[PDB]
Amino acid sequence: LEFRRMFSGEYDSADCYLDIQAGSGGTEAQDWASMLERMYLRWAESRGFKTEIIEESEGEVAGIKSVTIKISGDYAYGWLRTETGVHRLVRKSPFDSGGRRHTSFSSAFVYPEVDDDIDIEINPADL
RNA sequence: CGCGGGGUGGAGCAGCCUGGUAGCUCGUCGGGCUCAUAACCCGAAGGUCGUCGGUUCAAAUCCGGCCCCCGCAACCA
RNA sequence: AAAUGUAACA
RNA sequence: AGCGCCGGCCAACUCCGUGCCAGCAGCCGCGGUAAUACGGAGGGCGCGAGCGUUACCCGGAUUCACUGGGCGUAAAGGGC
RNA sequence: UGAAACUCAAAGGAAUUGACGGGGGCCCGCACAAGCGGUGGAGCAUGUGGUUUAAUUCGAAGCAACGCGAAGAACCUUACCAGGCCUUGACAUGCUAGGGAACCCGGGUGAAAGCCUGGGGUGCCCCGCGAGGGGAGCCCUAGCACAGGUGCUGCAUGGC
RNA sequence: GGCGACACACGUGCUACAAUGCCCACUACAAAGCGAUGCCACCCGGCAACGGGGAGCUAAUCGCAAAAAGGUGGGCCCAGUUCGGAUUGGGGUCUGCAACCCGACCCCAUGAAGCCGGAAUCGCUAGUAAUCGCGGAUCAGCCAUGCCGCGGUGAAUACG
RNA sequence: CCGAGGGUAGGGCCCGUGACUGGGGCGAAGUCGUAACAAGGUAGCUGUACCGGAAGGUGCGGCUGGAU
Ligand SMILES: [Mg+2]
Ligand SMILES: [Mg+2]
Ligand SMILES: [Mg+2]
Ligand SMILES: [Mg+2]
Ligand SMILES: [Mg+2]
Ligand SMILES: [Mg+2]
Ligand SMILES: [Mg+2]
Ligand SMILES: [Mg+2]
Ligand SMILES: [Mg+2]
Ligand SMILES: [Mg+2]
Ligand SMILES: [Mg+2]
Ligand SMILES: [Mg+2]
Ligand SMILES: [Mg+2]
Ligand SMILES: [Mg+2]
Ligand SMILES: [Mg+2]
Ligand SMILES: [Mg+2]
Ligand SMILES: [Mg+2]
Ligand SMILES: [Mg+2]
Ligand SMILES: [Mg+2]
Ligand SMILES: [Mg+2]
Ligand SMILES: [Mg+2]
Ligand SMILES: [Mg+2]
Ligand SMILES: [Mg+2]
Ligand SMILES: [Mg+2]
Ligand SMILES: [Mg+2]
Ligand SMILES: [Mg+2]
Ligand SMILES: [Mg+2]
Ligand SMILES: [Mg+2]
Ligand SMILES: [Mg+2]
Ligand SMILES: [Mg+2]
Ligand SMILES: [Mg+2]
Ligand SMILES: [Mg+2]
Ligand SMILES: [Mg+2]
Ligand SMILES: [Mg+2]
Ligand SMILES: [Mg+2]
Ligand SMILES: [Mg+2]
Ligand SMILES: [Mg+2]
Ligand SMILES: [Mg+2]
Ligand SMILES: [Mg+2]
Ligand SMILES: [Mg+2]
Ligand SMILES: [Mg+2]
Ligand SMILES: [Mg+2]
Ligand SMILES: [Mg+2]
Ligand SMILES: [Mg+2]
Ligand SMILES: [Mg+2]
Ligand SMILES: [Mg+2]
Ligand SMILES: [Mg+2]
Ligand SMILES: [Mg+2]
Ligand SMILES: [Mg+2]
Ligand SMILES: [Mg+2]
Ligand SMILES: [Mg+2]
Ligand SMILES: [Mg+2]
Ligand SMILES: [Mg+2]
Ligand SMILES: [Mg+2]
Ligand SMILES: [Mg+2]
Ligand SMILES: [Mg+2]
Ligand SMILES: [Mg+2]
Ligand SMILES: [Mg+2]
Ligand SMILES: [Mg+2]
Ligand SMILES: [Mg+2]
Ligand SMILES: [Mg+2]
Ligand SMILES: [Mg+2]
Ligand SMILES: [Mg+2]
Ligand SMILES: [Mg+2]
Ligand SMILES: [Mg+2]
Ligand SMILES: [Mg+2]
Ligand SMILES: [Mg+2]
Ligand SMILES: [Mg+2]
Ligand SMILES: [Mg+2]
Ligand SMILES: [Mg+2]
Ligand SMILES: [Mg+2]
Ligand SMILES: [Mg+2]
Ligand SMILES: [Mg+2]
Ligand SMILES: [Mg+2]
Ligand SMILES: [Mg+2]
Numbered sequence: 163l164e165f166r167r168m169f170s171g172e173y174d175s176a177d178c179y180l181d182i183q184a185g186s187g188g189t190e191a192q193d194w195a196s197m198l199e200r201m202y203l204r205w206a207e208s209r210g211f212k213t214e215i216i217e218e219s220e221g222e223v224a225g226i227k228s229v230t231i232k233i234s235g236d237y238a239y240g241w242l243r244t245e246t247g248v249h250r251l252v253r254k255s256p257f258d259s260g261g262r263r264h265t266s267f268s269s270a271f272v273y274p275e276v277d278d279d280i281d282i283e284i285n286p287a288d289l
Numbered sequence: 290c291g292c293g294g295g296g297u298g299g300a301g302c303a304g305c306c307u308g309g310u311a312g313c314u315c316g317u318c319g320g321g322c323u324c325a326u327a328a329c330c331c332g333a334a335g336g337u338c339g340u341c342g343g344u345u346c347a348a349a350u351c352c353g354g355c356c357c358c359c360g361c362a363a364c365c366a
Numbered sequence: 367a368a369a370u371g372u373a374a375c376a
Numbered sequence: 377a378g379c380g381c382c383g384g385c386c387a388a389c390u391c392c393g394u395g396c397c398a399g400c401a402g403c404c405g406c407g408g409u410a411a412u413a414c415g416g417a418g419g420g421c422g423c424g425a426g427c428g429u430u431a432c433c434c435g436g437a438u439u440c441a442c443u444g445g446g447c448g449u450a451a452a453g454g455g456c
Numbered sequence: 457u458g459a460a461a462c463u464c465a466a467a468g469g470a471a472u473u474g475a476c477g478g479g480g481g482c483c484c485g486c487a488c489a490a491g492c493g494g495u496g497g498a499g500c501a502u503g504u505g506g507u508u509u510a511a512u513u514c515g516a517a518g519c520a521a522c523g524c525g526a527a528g529a530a531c532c533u534u535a536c537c538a539g540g541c542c543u544u545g546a547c548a549u550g551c552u553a554g555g556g557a558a559c560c561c562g563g564g565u566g567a568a569a570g571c572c573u574g575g576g577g578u579g580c581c582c583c584g585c586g587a588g589g590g591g592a593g594c595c596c597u598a599g600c601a602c603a604g605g606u607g608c609u610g611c612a613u614g615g616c
Numbered sequence: 617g618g619c620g621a622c623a624c625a626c627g628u629g630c631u632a633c634a635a636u637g638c639c640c641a642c643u644a645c646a647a648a649g650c651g652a653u654g655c656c657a658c659c660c661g662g663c664a665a666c667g668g669g670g671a672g673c674u675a676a677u678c679g680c681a682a683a684a685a686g687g688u689g690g691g692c693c694c695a696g697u698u699c700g701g702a703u704u705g706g707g708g709u710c711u712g713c714a715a716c717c718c719g720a721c722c723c724c725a726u727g728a729a730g731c732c733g734g735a736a737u738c739g740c741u742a743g744u745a746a747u748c749g750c751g752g753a754u755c756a757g758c759c760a761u762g763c764c765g766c767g768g769u770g771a772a773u774a775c776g
Numbered sequence: 777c778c779g780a781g782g783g784u785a786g787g788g789c790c791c792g793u794g795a796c797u798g799g800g801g802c803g804a805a806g807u808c809g810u811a812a813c814a815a816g817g818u819a820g821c822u823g824u825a826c827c828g829g830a831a832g833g834u835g836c837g838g839c840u841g842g843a844u
Contacts, residue, residue: 186805188372189326223326223371227806252396252408254611255373256517257325262374263611265396265408267805 167240174240176274180231184221185248187266190258192225194251195268199229202245202270211235223257242272 168174180202184195203213212234221227233242248269255264 184805186373188805190373191805257371258373259371260375263408264374265804266373
């Protein structure tokens with residue numbers, strides 16, 4: 163009866179991908195973006211998933227502008243689709259000189275895996 | 290369909306022709322300089338040589354077949 | 367001869 | 377007997393809820409876990425069969441200056 | 457010659473105090489230079505970042521964090537983790553009601569804690585040759601107030 | 617049980633890479649401190665850690681205590697060595713209720729890296745640096761190569 | 777005859793609208809470089825001309841509202 167939470171979402175079993183992005187703020191949020199990939203990596207290890215990093219791009223001041231991880235595991239999309247959203251991080255900021263309290267956002271978008279095959283065969287019934 | 294040129298680390302190229310030895314640049318990784326990043330400095334890692342087969346003692350290299358890439362040609366009615 | 371430092375100063 | 381208001385201008389202050397959200401806002405600005413500025417309450421101030429809002433006119437605006445302004449550097453001397 | 461839509465709550469002049477300048481002048485400090493010995497390489501000790509972990513408690517973050525809080529982590533310390541337990545409780549001030557107070561000595565179970573339990577005599581001022589009747593010395597049991605928290609905020613603070 | 621983890625990364629230190637050195641034996645010269653379930657003379661057993669005896673000292677009295685470099689002699693002969701002392705095997709001691717994780721010390725055996733360190737970087741202007749040992753706080757014991765002190769020997773250089 | 781108006785033709789002005797295109801204003805965050813403010817690291821500004829991803833550069837002349 164607890165698989166009315168996860169058995170309701172078409173494909174809540176495909177090896178999903180996590181698409182994390184920096185955002186408002188910049189350096190601070192790129193720091194927070196790298197913090198948030200670490201957060202989901204340690205998450206996925208403590209849950210039997212495979213921590214499979216497909217594409218990075220590190221930020222130029224300090225941190226990550228964007229990342230994509232393959233959460234290669236079982237039922238992975240069910241758990242991480244309820245992680246889709248923009249994660250605000252209100253926090254206290256280290257890149258601002260006089261130590262001011264700042265807000266910086268970064269997102270986490272989550273999708274499953276499809277066939278990704280666009281090789282439709284030409285059949286003489288319709289030519 | 291024809292002719293002839295290519296495929297070699299993450300990227301772009303060199304290496305073949307006169308076989309044994311795969312190099313350069315950028316990147317990547319560890320260290321330094323800086324308050325910090327870039328730049329720079331020191332050290333390091335990195336290639337089934339498109340595949341099948343095989344020339345030879347030995348193939349990235351030589352010779353066939355296939356597979357993608359590039360150029361040219363495809364005329365006279 | 368040598369670049370840059372965003373976004374919340376009581 | 378109701379309506380507006382109680383951060384400054386501008387008269388009237390506390391408690392709770394909230395926690396850059398929900399919202400306020402005429403200007404300056406309020407709200408990121410002790411908010412007299414948001415929402416409710418208690419209390420208070422101002423009017424009263426009215427109280428506020430929007431629109432428009434004059435005023436404040438000597439901010440088109442007749443009364444009554446300016447032009448080196450603030451906007452402003454025409455190139456002669 | 458010369459607009460408007462739209463937009464902002466300013467754009468501005470001069471002067472002041474700072475701060476800064478790959479501006480200047482004059483000075484100082486093992487700042488450089490002059491030297492001598494090191495670190496960075498090795499093995500080890502130690503702290504830290506990470507990573508790992510059930511936990512590898514927590515803080516310190518350029519100089520001015522990193523043999524720093526730690527001038528002594530095997531248990532204790534210990535604030536973390538796992539497991540076994542306790543509920544006015546390891547500790548304060550209470551008020552109320554039952555036991556006997558008070559203190560020492562063993563038995564069972566158990567890793568220990570804890571749970572269970574068998575021992576034994578309470579002064580006082582007192583009716584006491586008498587059963588018996590306390591008060592409050594301190595403990596035990598049941599309550600209700602309360603305790604307790606190295607849980608957060610050093611960006612609410614004092615102190616250092 | 618963990619704070620002691622370990623593909624890695626940085627800071628602080630210890631010991632070194634040797635001949636101005638290492639080892640053995642003998643022999644000198646300090647200061648500041650600490651010490652009554654404490655400091656332990658001296659004796660004996662053990663190669664030893666240590667153990668068993670046992671005097672003294674509320675300590676300018678007695679004890680820790682030997683200071684070490686140094687000095688005098690002997691060995692080593694330039695080698696990864698009589699340098700270096702990591703790592704590991706085995707056997708023991710002591711503290712402690714208890715040394716698996718996770719103690720210090722002794723003995724036999726083993727005897728690693730390291731041939732003076734890239735970019736870079738630290739300290740010190742005189743009894744200083746360098747080097748040598750001694751004490752204490754904490755403390756059952758100790759992971760102290762740390763810290764706070766103490767004295768011994770004792771430089772180089774500063775144009776600017 | 778004139779004449780409301782209707783019709784034919786041609787102009788003028790104004791408004792709405794149009795594939796596409798030019799630049800402009802706003803922005804809590806992006807990319808590239810760092811032109812100006814200190815002599816801003818090539819003094820700055822300027823009219824003009826040519827040029828360049830971009831701020832901008834250079835020529836000619838001018839101003840000081842230019843440090844030493
Ligand atoms: Mg022809
Ligand atoms: Mg009102
Ligand atoms: Mg206020
Ligand atoms: Mg008023
Ligand atoms: Mg008032
Ligand atoms: Mg809300
Ligand atoms: Mg309101
Ligand atoms: Mg607050
Ligand atoms: Mg509140
Ligand atoms: Mg209160
Ligand atoms: Mg108001
Ligand atoms: Mg209110
Ligand atoms: Mg009336
Ligand atoms: Mg009205
Ligand atoms: Mg008006
Ligand atoms: Mg008027
Ligand atoms: Mg006038
Ligand atoms: Mg005027
Ligand atoms: Mg002007
Ligand atoms: Mg002007
Ligand atoms: Mg004139
Ligand atoms: Mg003109
Ligand atoms: Mg001025
Ligand atoms: Mg001034
Ligand atoms: Mg200066
Ligand atoms: Mg210095
Ligand atoms: Mg020097
Ligand atoms: Mg040197
Ligand atoms: Mg070194
Ligand atoms: Mg080292
Ligand atoms: Mg790392
Ligand atoms: Mg911490
Ligand atoms: Mg810590
Ligand atoms: Mg420090
Ligand atoms: Mg310690
Ligand atoms: Mg132990
Ligand atoms: Mg413990
Ligand atoms: Mg405990
Ligand atoms: Mg403070
Ligand atoms: Mg803090
Ligand atoms: Mg304070
Ligand atoms: Mg422990
Ligand atoms: Mg620790
Ligand atoms: Mg360990
Ligand atoms: Mg290192
Ligand atoms: Mg070190
Ligand atoms: Mg050390
Ligand atoms: Mg040393
Ligand atoms: Mg050897
Ligand atoms: Mg040896
Ligand atoms: Mg070697
Ligand atoms: Mg040698
Ligand atoms: Mg050296
Ligand atoms: Mg040396
Ligand atoms: Mg250097
Ligand atoms: Mg000095
Ligand atoms: Mg020495
Ligand atoms: Mg010592
Ligand atoms: Mg002592
Ligand atoms: Mg001790
Ligand atoms: Mg140890
Ligand atoms: Mg007619
Ligand atoms: Mg007519
Ligand atoms: Mg007509
Ligand atoms: Mg008609
Ligand atoms: Mg447009
Ligand atoms: Mg310029
Ligand atoms: Mg500039
Ligand atoms: Mg300039
Ligand atoms: Mg020009
Ligand atoms: Mg152009
Ligand atoms: Mg270009
Ligand atoms: Mg040019
Ligand atoms: Mg000129
Ligand atoms: Mg002129």
